[PDB]
Design a protein around this ligand. Structure first.
Ligand code: HEM
Length: 185
């Protein structure tokens, strides 16, 4: 398929508050390229800096099988609030499962962020082809419902919040310790 290209980065985006090393949980998401196979997973990420690099680690959990997978990337700023990341898939300890490779990368845009919440758009590419295309509502607390400010950002992006899938009743489990330690790997 083709990923959405036009996402606007938050005006006055504050990169220090966003990239502070702490965890963002995905509370709600809108996947524009869902698999045919019914999938309902949980995800979280942490973005910060390590040894002078911008780093992002990712965590995905499947409550039906208890399967988990992790990724870590160095990020490169394309413009204020827009980033590219060449990811590698890892075990929770950093051991590499799938190396960084050319056409494996995602780009993302921070459309809205404040101290507690954010709306991001991501385009996922594997071996030089547009795979996933996805908006995510994030919060710093896993039990928190999307507040008025973020729902406002969803509206401003010409999206319908009712289209999003909630992770709230999904029996999610998180591994924050590993996400945070992956930042240095
Ligand atoms: C925070 C924004 C997101 C980013 C930056 C992101 C990034 C990624 C990356 C880099 C991969 C490739 C993993 C690898 O093969 O090493 C991936 C795959 C995947 N992600 Fe996300 N993701 C995001 C949101 C989500 C959400 C909200 C969900 C579900 C709740 C999700 C579920 C999945 C699934 C099921 C795959 C596997 C695709 C496959 O193996 O064919 N992602 N994502």
């Amino acid at each position: 398929m083709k990923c959405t290209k036009n996402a606007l980065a938050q005006t006055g985006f504050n990169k220090d508050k966003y990239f502070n090393g702490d965890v963002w949980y995905v509370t709600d998401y809108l996947d524009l390229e869902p698999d045919d196979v019914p999938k309902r997973y949980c995800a979280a990420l942490a973005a910060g800096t390590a040894s002078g690099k911008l780093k992002e680690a990712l965590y995905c959990y499947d409550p039906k099988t208890q399967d988990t997978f992790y990724d870590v990337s160095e990020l490169q700023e394309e413009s204020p609030g827009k980033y590219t990341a060449n990811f590698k898939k890892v075990e929770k300890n950093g051991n590499v499962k799938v190396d960084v490779t050319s056409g494996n990368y995602y780009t993302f845009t921070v459309m809205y962020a404040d101290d507690s919440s954010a709306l991001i758009h991501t385009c996922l590419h594997k071996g030089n082809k547009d795979l996933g295309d996805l908006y995510a509502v994030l919060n710093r607390n896993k039990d928190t419902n999307a507040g008025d400010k973020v729902k406002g950002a969803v509206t401003a992006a010409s999206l319908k919040f009712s289209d999003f899938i909630s992770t709230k009743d999904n029996k999610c489990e998180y591994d924050n310790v590993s996400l945070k330690s992956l930042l240095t790997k």
